């Protein structure tokens, strides 16, 4: 059976309990924690590409008020479709399953200024989603897993000083 497990789930849950934040910048900022998954039940012989996108979680934006995240108004129009191709793509099942798949180089941005970046709306909540695309498949089979532990609010600057401190502690 195909199984995609979140790595460092305990670390992600430490951030999620505070409400996770990821910085977005003009030039793009790498994530901490880094999304990493373990994979079993691929065809070791088949070739696959790994894609990453970010799904908008809510029909509203968020605001940090009195040390609490609360609904902060109507959402901006959805960020454009941005898919990140894992740089090991395409590769054998055996490649993806032999060691955890790390999305260490993906950059989150609030400006479409190129460079394979992911455009996100500040003060909106997103949930990372990984797609496994089988290569040379006339049916273009794709599997999609969501990672609820990895939900975060995109921010131009950290709102919660406990998040700022956590990011420094574990990174
Ligand atoms: O789908 C399965 C699974 C396990 C047994 C039968 O199916 N898993 C395990 C739980 N997962 C995690 O990411 C763990 C929290 C870290 C996702 C993958």
Swiss-Prot record:
Feature: DNA-binding region: 11-171
Main localization of the protein described in the UniProt heading: nucleus
GO biological process terms held by the UniProt record: anterior/posterior axis specification, embryo; cardiac muscle cell myoblast differentiation; cell fate specification; heart morphogenesis; mesoderm development; mesoderm formation; negative regulation of transcription by RNA polymerase II; positive regulation of transcription by RNA polymerase II
Compartments in which it is found: Nucleus
Tissues with expression: Detected in testis, but not in other, normal tissues. Detected in lung tumors (at protein level).
Organism domain of life: Eukaryota
GO MF entry, a single one: DNA-binding transcription factor activity
Any one Gene Ontology cellular component term annotated for this protein: chromatin
Record's disease association: Neural tube defects: Congenital malformations of the central nervous system and adjacent structures related to defective neural tube closure during the first trimester of pregnancy. Failure of neural tube closure can occur at any level of the embryonic axis. Common NTD forms include anencephaly, myelomeningocele and spina bifida, which result from the failure of fusion in the cranial and spinal region of the neural tube. NTDs have a multifactorial etiology encompassing both genetic and environmental components.
Subunit-level organization: Monomer.
Summary of the function given for this chain in its UniProt record: Involved in the transcriptional regulation of genes required for mesoderm formation and differentiation. Binds to a palindromic T site 5'-TTCACACCTAGGTGTGAA-3' DNA sequence and activates gene transcription when bound to such a site.
Protein name per Swiss-Prot or TrEMBL: T-box transcription factor T
Species for this entry: Homo sapiens
Gene expressing this chain: TBXT
């Amino acid at each position: 059976e195909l199984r995609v497990g979140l790595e460092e789930s305990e670390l992600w849950l430490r951030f999620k309990e505070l409400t996770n934040e990821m910085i977005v910048t003009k030039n793009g900022r790498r994530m901490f924690p880094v999304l990493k998954v373990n994979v079993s039940g691929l065809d070791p012989n088949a070739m696959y590409s790994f894609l990453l996108d970010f799904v908008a979680a809510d029909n509203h934006r968020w605001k940090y008020v009195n040390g609490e995240w609360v609904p902060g108004g109507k959402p901006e129009p959805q960020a454009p479709s941005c898919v990140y191709i894992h740089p090991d793509s395409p590769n054998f099942g055996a490649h993806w399953m032999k060691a955890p798949v790390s999305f260490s180089k993906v950059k989150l941005t609030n400006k479409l200024n190129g460079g394979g970046q992911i455009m996100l709306n500040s003060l909106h909540k997103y949930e990372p989603r990984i797609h496994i695309v089988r290569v040379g498949d006339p049916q273009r089979m794709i599997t999609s897993h969501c990672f609820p532990e990895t939900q975060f609010i995109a921010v131009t600057a950290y709102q919660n000083e406990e998040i700022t401190a956590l990011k420094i502690k574990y990174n």
